Structure formats: C-alpha cells, structure tokens
Amino acid sequence: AVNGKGMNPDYKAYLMAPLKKIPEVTNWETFENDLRWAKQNGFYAITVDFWWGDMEKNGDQQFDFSYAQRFAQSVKNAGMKMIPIISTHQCGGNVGDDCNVPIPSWVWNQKSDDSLYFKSETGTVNKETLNPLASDVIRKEYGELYTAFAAAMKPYKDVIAKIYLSGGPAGELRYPSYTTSDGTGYPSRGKFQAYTEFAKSKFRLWVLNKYGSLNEVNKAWGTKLISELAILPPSDGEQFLMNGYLSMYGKDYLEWYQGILENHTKLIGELAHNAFDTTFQVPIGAKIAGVHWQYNNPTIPHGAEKPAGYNDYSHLLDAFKSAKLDVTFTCLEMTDKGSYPEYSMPKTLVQNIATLANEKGIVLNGENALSIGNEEEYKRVAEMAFNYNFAGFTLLRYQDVMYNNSLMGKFKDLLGVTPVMQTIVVKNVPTTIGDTVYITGNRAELGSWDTKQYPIQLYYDSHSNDWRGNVVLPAERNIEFKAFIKSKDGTVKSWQTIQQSWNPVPLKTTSHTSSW
Numbered sequence: 102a103v104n105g106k107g108m109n110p111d112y113k114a115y116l117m118a119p120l121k122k123i124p125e126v127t128n129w130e131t132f133e134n135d136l137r138w139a140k141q142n143g144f145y146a147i148t149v150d151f152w153w154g155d156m157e158k159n160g161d162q163q164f165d166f167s168y169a170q171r172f173a174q175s176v177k178n179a180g181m182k183m184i185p186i187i188s189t190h191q192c193g194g195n196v197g198d199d200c201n202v203p204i205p206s207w208v209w210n211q212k213s214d215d216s217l218y219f220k221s222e223t224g225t226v227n228k229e230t231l232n233p234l235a236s237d238v239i240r241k242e243y244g245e246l247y248t249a250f251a252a253a254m255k256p257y258k259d260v261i262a263k264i265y266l267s268g269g270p271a272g273e274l275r276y277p278s279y280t281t282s283d284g285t286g287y288p289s290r291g292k293f294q295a296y297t298e299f300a301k302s303k304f305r306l307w308v309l310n311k312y313g314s315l316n317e318v319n320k321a322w323g324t325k326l327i328s329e330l331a332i333l334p335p336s337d338g339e340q341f342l343m344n345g346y347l348s349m350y351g352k353d354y355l356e357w358y359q360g361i362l363e364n365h366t367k368l369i370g371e372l373a374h375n376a377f378d379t380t381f382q383v384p385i386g387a388k389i390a391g392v393h394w395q396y397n398n399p400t401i402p403h404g405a406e407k408p409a410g411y412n413d414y415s416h417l418l419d420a421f422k423s424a425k426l427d428v429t430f431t432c433l434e435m436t437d438k439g440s441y442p443e444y445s446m447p448k449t450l451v452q453n454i455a456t457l458a459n460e461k462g463i464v465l466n467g468e469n470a471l472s473i474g475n476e477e478e479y480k481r482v483a484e485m486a487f488n489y490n491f492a493g494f495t496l497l498r499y500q501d502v503m504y505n506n507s508l509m510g511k512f513k514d515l516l517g518v519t520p521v522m523q524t525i526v527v528k529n530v531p532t533t534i535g536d537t538v539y540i541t542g543n544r545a546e547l548g549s550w551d552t553k554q555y556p557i558q559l560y561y562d563s564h565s566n567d568w569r570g571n572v573v574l575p576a577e578r579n580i581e582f583k584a585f586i587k588s589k590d591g592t593v594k595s596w597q598t599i600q601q602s603w604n605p606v607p608l609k610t611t612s613h614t615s616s617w
C-alpha cells in the first residue's frame with residue numbers, strides 16, 4: 102500500500118442487505134442460513150436499511166421497531182453482526198424499483214412554508230429527504246427517532262457492530278441534484294437545490310452577515326445590486342458552473358451551499374452520539390456520494406459535484422472529523438474514462454477522498470456503486486481498498502453473491518480476507534548506503550507488483566544485518582512476492598534472486614525468512 106504501509110489490520114468485509122424486507126425475498130430460516138454462508142465466506146456483518154417511513158409511520162412518536170427487532174433476532178440466531186442504517190430518506194419512490202418507502206407523510210405538516218423540501222433552478226420540487234436548512238425540524242424529529250431506536254435495539258446491542266446515518270437522498274450527504282424528474286440524471290450536470298423562498302432567504306441573511314450592508318456586498322462582489330432582495334442564488338446554473346464560480350460571489354455562494362451540509366453533519370452526528378454512545382458504544386458514520394461524472398468537463402468543471410454540494414472535499418471531511426463520524430465512499434470498482442460525454446473520473450475521485458481522509462484520520466469504508474458481475478471488478482475493488490487503507494468494504498448487494506456460488510468464491514478469495522500480522526525477513530541484501538528495501542507481491546494487499554506507489558517497506562536490523570518488517574497480510578491465501586532495493590533516487594536498482602511465496606499465509610503469527 103500507499104506511503105510504504107500495508108493493508109489496514111482492521112479490514113472487515115460487509116454485505117448490503119436487499120432493499121425489500123427479508124419476508125418479501127425469502128423466509129427467516131433460509132435468511133439465517135444465508136447469513137451463515139456469508140460469514141463462511143468472510144462477511145463480518147450485514148448492513149441494512151431501516152426506513153423512517155416504516156419506523157414512525159402513522160404519526161409523531163407512534164413508533165414501530167418490530168421489523169428491526171425481528172431482523173436482529175435472526176442476525177443473532179445466525180451468530181452474525183449487523184450495521185443498521187437509520188434511513189431517514191425515501192426508498193425508491195419511482196417506477197420499477199424495489200421499494201417505495203416515503204418519509205412519514207406527517208412530517209411535511211410541521212411547517213407552512215417551504216423550509217422543509219427542496220426546489221431546483223427550474224422549479225422541480227424534491228421531497229426525498231428533509232432539507233438540512235430546516236435544522237429545527239431536523240433536531241426535533243431526528244433526535245426523537247434516534248433515541249426511540251436506541252431504546253428498542255438495546256436487547257440487541259451485542260449484535261450491533263456500528264450505526265450509520267442518512268444525511269440526505271439515497272443515504273448520501275448531498276443535495277438532490279441528479280434526478281430524472283429535474284432533467285439532471287447521470288451523466289448530465291446537476292441543478293442547484295437552493296431555490297425555495299427559504300434558502301434564498303438564508304443565503305441573503307448569511308451574505309449580509311458577512312458584509313454587514315448591501316453596500317459592503319456590492320463592494321466585495323464588485324457589483325451594483327439595487328436592493329437586498331437582489332442577493333440571490335445563481336439564475337443560470339450553466340453559466341455559474343461555466344465561470345461565475347470563479348468570482349468572489351461564486352466563491353461565497355458555494356461556501357454557503359456546501360456549508361449547510363457541513364453543519365447538518367455536525368448536527369446529526371451530535372444527536373446520534375448522545376443517543377447511542379452510552380448504550381451501544383460503537384462507531385457511527387455517514388455516507389458521501391461518488392459523483393464522478395462531469396469531473397473533468399472543460400466547459401463546466403466538476404459539473405455534477407458542485408450542484409450536489411461537493412465543492413471542497415477537504416473542508417467537507419473536516420466537518421466529519423469534528424462530528425466524529427466514519428465515512429463511506431462509493432465507486433471502488435470503477436476506472437477512469439474521462440471522455441465525452443460523461444467525463445467520468447471515479448478512480449481519481451476515490452483516490453482523492455481516500456488520501457484526504459487518511460491525512461485527517463477519518464475511518465474509511467468503501468462501497469461499490471453498481472453490481473459486480475466479474476472477478477475484474479473485485480480485483481479493482483481489492484486495489485483501492487487494500488492500497489488506500491480502507492477499514493471496510495461493503496458489497497452491494499445481497500443477492501449477487503448469495504445466489505451465485507462462483508462469484509461468492511471470487512469474493513472470498515479477493516475481498517473476504519482476514520488481516521494477519523507477519524514478519525517478512527530478507528537476509529543477505531547488497532544494500533549500499535542510501536538504499537531502501539521494499540517488497541511487492543502478486544495480490545493487491547502486497548501491491549499487485551507495483552514498485553513506485555504501493556510497495557511495503559522493510560527496515561534494517563543492525564543487530565542481525567537483515568532487512569525485516571511487520572506486514573499485515575491476507576490470512577490463508579497464497580502469496581508470491583519479491584524484495585527489491587530502491588536507491589535514494591527512488592530508482593529500482595535490483596530485485597531478489599528468486600521470487601518467494603507463502604502457500605498459504607498461516608493463520609498464526611510467524612516469520613518468513615528468505616535470502617537475496
């Protein structure tokens with residue numbers, strides 16, 4: 102892996118449950134047996150969606166956690182762990198998908214205005230999640246929801262491995278900028294979701310708080326606004342994304358726009374920490390979308406990320422370290438295309454989020470965006486996950502490996518791995534001054550034979566004159582590798598005479614000694 106280190110010793114693989122409830126898929130007994138089969142292949146937990154639309158349906162605080170309870174009973178019977186996702190967003194909702202669980206329709210009557218939903222550049226209304234701008238309804242409704250759930254899942258705390266939160270549409274912390282209804286579906290650019298009277302208002306009160314007076318606003322934006330009512334979100338998102346984003350106004354609008362997400366993150370992460378910390382004592386996290394299309398579009402750069410609210414990921418992730426939340430990112434199985442018309446750069450995006458995240462000490466969890474049909478995608482996932490320090494990989498979805506044994510075997514081989522500590526030792530290395538020793542191997546956990554970005558580093562032991570190093574490895578898998586010397590100039594001088602191997606890597610901690 103990256104920075105000369107190994108795979109994360111805390112890597113655990115997880116399975117995403119289906120969208121539909123288990124009794125709409127199979128029965129609780131073959132579900133338990135499927136969970137046993139999963140764990141037999143390296144899955145540690147099953148991550149599942151518990152929808153607010155189901156858990157507090159009839160009215161305010163007329164709660165039903167019977168399904169969540171029933172579901173954790175089988176998880177306990179199967180001797181598995183689970184990761185509930187308190188899904189405060191809508192499931193499906195439209196034509197042809199495997200669910201339609203709206204958010205409890207009584208929520209929308211808490212206000213008379215438009216504080217609560219979203220409206221786009223062209224007037225499209227979106228009601229998939231509650232608008233983070235309405236933080237008073239969000240503190241009331243989410244706080245209560247979270248604590249009623251902690252109360253009912255307390256019997257099952259020994260089966261809860263972590264708790265995930267929904268921060269927006271599709272469980273992603275972002276705005277509803279890409280939808281078929283708004284004419285923004287992949288691979289086109291999103292539209293801004295700041296046109297409700299309430300957002301418009303909140304932008305103008307923010308701007309005015311920064312500058313003080315309209316006069317000060319016109320001074321800083323180099324404009325000539327008439328009234329304060331002229332302080333508005335962009336009227337042409339296409340022009341904004343084209344170049345209005347470079348002006349001081351543009352920079353202030355996007356700071357406000359991304360800022361609401363950052364605040365929403367500190368707020369749901371506060372409410373969930375209060376409610377689940379004493380009782381459960383588990384890591385809590387939220388998800389961020391991989392809006393990889395229109396990344397490198399020359400005309401409208403980062404054309405889909407900026408309407409979704411992702412303008413400065415370093416600053417966005419900073420809201421996550423402060424709220425003490427883990428982050429899940431989503432397209433580990435994709436590669437970079439970067440061409441017309443989609444301008445898709447997903448592998449560069451995941452490499453960037455991964456690096457900021459490790460620089461900040463935020464725990465990474467990966468997810469694949471789409472279903473994986475071949476070994477290849479699993480091998481691509483293995484590369485990001487193991488070379489960019491992911492503490493977890495959640496496979497999307499259940500039925501894909503559960504009703505295809507060959508694919509499940511490929512998963513077991515590449516991603517349903519258990520990390521184990523091992524000492525690699527290389528004797529008789531002709532290391533002249535300045536040189537460094539590295540090992541690279543065949544599996545992605547050893548760098549896929551790469552020597553510049555991903556090799557793991559070994560350190561000279563002066564007492565016994567060999568290069569050695571405690572490497573985290575895939576327990577019980579066959580590995581091949583070789584040591585090599587990287588001269589001070591980062592140049593590969595030479596390699597080990599004979600390629601080494603461990604068939605398989607023992608499950609216990611040993612040492613593999615070998616000579617140059």
Ligand SMILES: [Ca+2]
Nearest residue numbers: 161162242245
């Ligand atoms: Ca409530």
